[PDB]
C-alpha cells in the first residue's frame, strides 16, 4: 500500500544495525521491486515441483 521503507538518518554503523535488526519482518516481494504476485508465482512453481517430485517418487 501507501507505506514505504524509510532510510535511517543516522551516521554511525550502530544506528544502521539497530534499524535492520528492527525491520518489520513482514518481507514481501514488493520490497525487492518485484510485483507482490511474484511470491504467489514462486509458490505455485514450488508446488508444481513438489508434485513432480512426488510423481517421480512412485
UniProtKB/Swiss-Prot annotation:
It is found in: Cytoplasm, Cytoskeleton. It comes from the Eukaryota. Signal peptide: none annotated. Homodimer. The cytoplasmic dynein 1 complex consists of two catalytic heavy chains (HCs) and a number of non-catalytic subunits presented by intermediate chains (ICs), light intermediate chains (LICs) and light chains (LCs); the composition seems to vary in respect to the IC, LIC and LC composition. The heavy chain homodimer serves as a scaffold for the probable homodimeric assembly of the respective non-catalytic subunits. The ICs and LICs bind directly to the HC dimer and dynein LCs assemble on the IC dimer. Interacts with DYNC1LI1; DYNC1LI1 and DYNC1LI2 bind mutually exclusive to DYNC1H1. Belongs to the dynein heavy chain family. It is linked to Charcot-Marie-Tooth disease, axonal, type 2O: An axonal form of Charcot-Marie-Tooth disease, a disorder of the peripheral nervous system, characterized by progressive weakness and atrophy, initially of the peroneal muscles and later of the distal muscles of the arms. Charcot-Marie-Tooth disease is classified in two main groups on the basis of electrophysiologic properties and histopathology: primary peripheral demyelinating neuropathies (designated CMT1 when they are dominantly inherited) and primary peripheral axonal neuropathies (CMT2). Dynein heavy chains probably consist of an N-terminal stem (which binds cargo and interacts with other dynein components), and the head or motor domain. The motor contains six tandemly-linked AAA domains in the head, which form a ring. A stalk-like structure (formed by two of the coiled coil domains) protrudes between AAA 4 and AAA 5 and terminates in a microtubule-binding site. A seventh domain may also contribute to this ring; it is not clear whether the N-terminus or the C-terminus forms this extra domain. Cytoplasmic dynein 1 acts as a motor for the intracellular retrograde motility of vesicles and organelles along microtubules. Dynein has ATPase activity; the force-producing power stroke is thought to occur on release of ADP. Plays a role in mitotic spindle assembly and metaphase plate congression. This is Cytoplasmic dynein 1 heavy chain 1. It comes from Homo sapiens. The gene is DYNC1H1. The chain holds residues 4290 to 4347 of 4646 of the full protein.
Amino acid at each position: 500500500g501507501h507505506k514505504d521503507i524509510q532510510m535511517p538518518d543516522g551516521i554511525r554503523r550502530e544506528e544502521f544495525v539497530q534499524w535492520v535488526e528492527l525491520l518489520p519482518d513482514t518481507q514481501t516481494p514488493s520490497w525487492l521491486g518485484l510485483p507482490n504476485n511474484a511470491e504467489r508465482v514462486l509458490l505455485t512453481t514450488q508446488g508444481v515441483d513438489m508434485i513432480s517430485k512426488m510423481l517421480k517418487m512412485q
